[PDB]
Amino acid sequence: LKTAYTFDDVLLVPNKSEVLPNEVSLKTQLTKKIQLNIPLMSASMDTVTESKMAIAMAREGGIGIIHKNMTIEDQAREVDRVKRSGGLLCGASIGVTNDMMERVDAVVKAKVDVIVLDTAHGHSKGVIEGVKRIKAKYPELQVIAGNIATPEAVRDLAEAGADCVKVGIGPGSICTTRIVAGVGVPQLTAVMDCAEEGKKLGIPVIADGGLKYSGDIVKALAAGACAAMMGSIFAGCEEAPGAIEIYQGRSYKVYRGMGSLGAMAKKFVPEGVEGRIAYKGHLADTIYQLIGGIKSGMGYLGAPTLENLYENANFVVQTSAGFRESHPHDINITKEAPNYS
Amino acid sequence: ILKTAYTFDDVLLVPNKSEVLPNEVSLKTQLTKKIQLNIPLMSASMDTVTESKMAIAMAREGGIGIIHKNMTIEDQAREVDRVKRSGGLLCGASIGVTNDMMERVDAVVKAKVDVIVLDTAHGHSKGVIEGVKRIKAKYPELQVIAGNIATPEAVRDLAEAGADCVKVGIGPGSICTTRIVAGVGVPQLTAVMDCAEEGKKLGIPVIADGGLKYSGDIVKALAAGACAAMMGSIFAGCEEAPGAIEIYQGRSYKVYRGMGSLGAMAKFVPEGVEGRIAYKGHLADTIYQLIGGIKSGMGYLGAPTLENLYENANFVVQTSAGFRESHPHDINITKEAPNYS
Amino acid sequence: ARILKTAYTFDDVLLVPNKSEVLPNEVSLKTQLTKKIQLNIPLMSASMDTVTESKMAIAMAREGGIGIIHKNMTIEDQAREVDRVKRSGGLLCGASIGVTNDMMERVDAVVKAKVDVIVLDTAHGHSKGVIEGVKRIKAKYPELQVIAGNIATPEAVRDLAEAGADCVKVGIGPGSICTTRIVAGVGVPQLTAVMDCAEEGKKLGIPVIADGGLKYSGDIVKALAAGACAAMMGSIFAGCEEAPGAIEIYQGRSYKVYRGMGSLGAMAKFVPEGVEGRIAYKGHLADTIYQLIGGIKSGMGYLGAPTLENLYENANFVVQTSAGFRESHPHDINITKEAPNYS
Amino acid sequence: RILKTAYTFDDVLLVPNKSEVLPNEVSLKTQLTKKIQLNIPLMSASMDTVTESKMAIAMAREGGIGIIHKNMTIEDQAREVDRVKRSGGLLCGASIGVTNDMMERVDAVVKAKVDVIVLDTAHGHSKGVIEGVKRIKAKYPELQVIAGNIATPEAVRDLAEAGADCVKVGIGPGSICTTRIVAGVGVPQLTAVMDCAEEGKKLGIPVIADGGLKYSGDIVKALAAGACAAMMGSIFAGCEEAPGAIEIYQGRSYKVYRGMGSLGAMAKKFVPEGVEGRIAYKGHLADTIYQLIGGIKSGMGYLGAPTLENLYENANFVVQTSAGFRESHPHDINITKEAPNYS
Ligand SMILES: C=C(C)c1cccc(C(C)(C)NC(=O)Nc2ccc(Cl)c(OCC(=O)O)c2)c1
Ligand SMILES: C=C(C)c1cccc(C(C)(C)NC(=O)Nc2ccc(Cl)c(OCC(=O)O)c2)c1
Ligand SMILES: C=C(C)c1cccc(C(C)(C)NC(=O)Nc2ccc(Cl)c(OCC(=O)O)c2)c1
Ligand SMILES: C=C(C)c1cccc(C(C)(C)NC(=O)Nc2ccc(Cl)c(OCC(=O)O)c2)c1
Ligand SMILES: O=c1[nH]cnc2c1ncn2[C@@H]1O[C@H](COP(=O)(O)O)[C@@H](O)[C@H]1O
Ligand SMILES: O=c1[nH]cnc2c1ncn2[C@@H]1O[C@H](COP(=O)(O)O)[C@@H](O)[C@H]1O
Ligand SMILES: O=c1[nH]cnc2c1ncn2[C@@H]1O[C@H](COP(=O)(O)O)[C@@H](O)[C@H]1O
Ligand SMILES: O=c1[nH]cnc2c1ncn2[C@@H]1O[C@H](COP(=O)(O)O)[C@@H](O)[C@H]1O
User: How is domain C1-343 classified at the architecture level of CATH?
Assistant: First the structure.
């Protein structure tokens, strides 16, 4: 049995640097045809991304994926609100269902830029045939297929015609897939394995779920992922759907998995939980902290571009004792940091 | 030092290419060569888990229950008979290595029990080996499960005495202090694996008994090669289990104790503890969650049958960091999930 | 590379079951503390002033074990304590001795009091002082049984065996009240230390004592399977009524004071190597001993061992991770009744 | 792409050695360079909550050295240096950053007779630091230059070639540090020290083990790894001589402590790499040093090491697990008394 690692298992080693954090470029190719100015995407979840999130993401240089837990017409409307807010980029998740192409037609007429054929188990007959049929009707349409965790999945989805694949089985902060079904692979080893296959095929991969800190994004990108998708980092922002609740003098936002009971009900066996996270203000202040943390990581590693970061990044594995050293330790913190807990 | 040994929380199953949905998979399993179950679940023989009402309900769901032996021989026969009357359902019976062993066996077979479980603390022992041979001598066709053991040597030796099936588990029990008190045991996932591996070479099933907390654990135990999975904790809060409801801060709990605890054996030197657990309601509802979870994991792994799940399962070890990613994290869960906590 | 050996303590490992022809009540817990000194059970009470004086050493001896009277008292007082134990039936008794100018005056007085065995006990047993101490004790008192410690390496076992040690005490820093690893950065995880010292002890024919870091009876079984001839405990015995010290009330419960011999309080410009605290009152020693003995016999039955020696020759260990540890203790239950061997 | 498992201090223990020397026999003497001898191998961190003139004077009088922090006007820091230089020719240091005004800061601490500058930066393996050392050594050939912070042998070899007299190792281990969280970058501090020390020995360059030390034992491990000295902020920030307000929380008095990369420090937007907090007030620096020195002498005593060079040459390391980590700290006891060297 081989050991697989997540982000908190590894640290990136400093390289010689001639660049400073404000000198590096975060541009990335989400697909051959879609370039993003920062490597960040908001999750296609009903407590993270609707048109208001998708607009602010796009203005920051990333992209949002409008969730599909709504009627076909309303999702087309959401996409429409983004595209009419100054020609920004927009995505939209699609499902393996009988009405699948009826939903695609709608958001395609609303000029969506990318579709995410998004399922619990992406390495499947449904998703492979779905990609083919979507490409049959819309050959120009950019397709992201997921979710997967193995290089074999990258191959089979690349052959179905996906323009991009999304890596992540069970890392999500609100996910119980690993509890309920016992299936997953630790996210850093997942992205590393699939990214290396992605680059042999010329197909990019997205690191999706399990990211908590800007440093976790740096590890994902250094592992070969074109981009990072978050729910929990963005769920607490004002632009995410759902009002703020105040509890014990602090303010929180509802955040829940799309396999949770609340989400699915808009019996069954959930693969996600429903809870609340701390309110973080506007999306612009979160994005800034993440971007700054990413540029800081790339500086330590001497990388002026994302591709140079990936070709020169060395990881080391840290134990549970290294873990404690790598977070603030042996101190009573009195003031919360803007980029730490 | 032999080697490192893993339990359920140490490992994850790797997704496979899949052409089958969770609702397409079959859960049928051979408990012995003569006894098929529609689903691979067993309720433990404990005085707070399985009497006739629980073995009736387990049987209705396609499983089986083992009526505990902490009662007179007469009452145990009644309980079996109470089960068989209710539509010819399948029933099991716990026998111990005692003086009245044949007397107890005599009565449970008169009530037409389908399988007996000759189980002791240390099943790899002259007592059990000789016990099996003696039972099989007087009742050759009667199905006999022997346990508990944790080594392939034990599997081979129990097989050569005549056991129709062997039960794996020394110390994983949620109420168990054997490993604390005696320092003895094998992490349950490594034991089932090494034991199933030997057991399959001999044509003898092994049962994963003890230590199961969630449905994903059952999937791990079956991917490892168990023909079935035996639970105490998961069933012991259900309506059909014996024991009084106590209310603590407006919530309903239910007694659950080890058979080697003080209360059960009633100086003594116990090897279990005694306590309370959240009342879960009807068994059928708990079984529904566990069953959904198993079908979900088998769909993730492309396996339409348990045997195909065993042949194509790939485990990866996760660190304690992988472990924190593999549970909901960085959220205050506000709603209760039917399959998590 | 300087870092290649991983070392394990008791919670890292589990004993694998063996085929068994023995039941728990059939096993023999007898063991040779030294060639001259047999014990009926392999338990010793620590030479600490919150653990062992005459009252604790008397009670340990009646149960088949032995206590070591601590040396934080005047020479005359330690000899009275020894005499007290020895006068009450000829029970076994040990006593502690340090590397000091008056070392032999202390050894004289406990020998006049009929002590069966002395422990030349220092923080660093693998030292010129302790090596020459044994030599000088054996020259004045050749028949005197001498345990030397504490140590943690096979080289330590050999050198002290060659000084005259009849038995070697192993444990650098596993103590529940010990800060040696904290303060100095020095130690060996206790199960690997015992394994490695026992193995060298066996080649030379000198027994070794697993000293410190035992919590539950299962740990003692691992100590014995690893080769130790006997096991020494402060924490497990310190709550008992026979342990010296006051009853403090905290959160409405009764505790008894327990502290390192290297702590500030025990030593009364000090740099201590242990702390001072309280553990919950356990009642009398007979209860605690009884559960320990019950647990050791249980594990020997799981391993088919009728003697401590047979347990050592046939014990296989398996390493468990921090997730295995979680499974190896009770889990997912609000325990509602007090267990006599688990808290 | 995973190179190796890397270790920090709590991952390891030093194995005892045969010893002919007691703790009060060992020498703690060391040197930053041949020109900068220290009676003990300890330096207080250059942080605005750790080392101004008061702390440098007292560090100097205990045989260590203080690095006056640079979060102040060039004039003020030279004044602070001049203040410790006049208190009996005590040794002094001063931290310099890679800024536009950096040569005038060097000029001004040089005129004040400072003994060593620390060109201190977030990422020391950089063209900026490399060029900085060259510029400093070209104008002041005799000035002792420490350069950091770094974590790799390659960085050692580069800074050595720039002209650095001493290299400072530590990316991420700081108690107040979030670099590893926000940027994902760092190297567990024991492996970093060990690899950088070994590269520094091939080149004749000494390395300083900076950050992540919590107990006196951690320092022993760093010196045995080959560091010539150890730098600490958390351990000294609680002392009376440290700058910083006293806060009170549940019966204890605290001192403010914060990373130089936190929000408060940088305010003399921002993406911080450190946090702002508080540390238990410890009283006078003399008592903290006494416990640190005594703990270090204790560990060298255990390793049979009469000097730091002998400590480094004979130190064997062993890896403990999380289970072993729980054994290496006081366990299973309600600790009722403060220990002067353990909290
Ligand atoms: C993000 C997740 C996980 C998720 C989101 C919304 C719902 C679910 C529910 C329904 C709970 N779970 C499943 O569908 N689980 C499942 C598991 C295995 C297979 Cl092969 C499968 O194949 C159908 C498909 O791929 O749609 C499905 C889960
Ligand atoms: C499920 C467990 C663990 C259990 C259930 C009810 C009682 C016990 C008690 C009595 C506490 N414990 C033992 O019997 N323990 C033991 C230990 C070793 C041997 Cl070989 C042995 O062999 C005799 C027998 O098999 O009765 C027994 C335990
Ligand atoms: C049980 C322990 C640990 C202990 C008990 C009472 C006192 C101490 C104090 C004094 C705190 N600590 C020491 O003596 N520590 C020390 C450390 C290294 C050496 Cl080599 C040494 O060599 C003299 C000797 O071997 O006594 C001594 C500790
Ligand atoms: C000791 C730490 C951690 C630290 C101290 C004061 C400030 C900082 C702030 C500003 C938060 N962080 C940075 O400057 N971070 C950074 C990261 C990469 C590079 Cl290449 C870089 O190049 C300038 C330099 O190395 O001076 C800088 C951090
Ligand atoms: O309920 C669910 N079960 C499993 N995964 C989910 C569920 N809902 C969302 N996800 C995934 O989890 C990701 C968010 O993870 P987070 O950034 O760690 O909070 C999403 O982008 C999806 O890939
Ligand atoms: O007190 C006991 N000591 C040790 N094992 C026990 C005891 N009582 C029940 N068991 C075992 O533990 C299993 C239940 O474990 P659970 O499913 O984790 O709650 C049973 O099926 C027995 O194999
Ligand atoms: O203060 C001390 N520092 C380090 N070890 C000590 C100290 N006092 C007692 N010991 C050791 O710790 C053992 C007790 O460990 P315990 O059984 O884990 O509580 C004693 O037998 C001594 O070997
Ligand atoms: O804010 C910062 N971010 C990261 N490291 C810092 C910061 N400020 C100081 N340091 C480092 O942390 C060390 C002190 O760590 P400590 O001794 O664990 O408290 C200093 O000597 C610096 O090397």
Answer: Alpha-Beta Barrel (3.20)
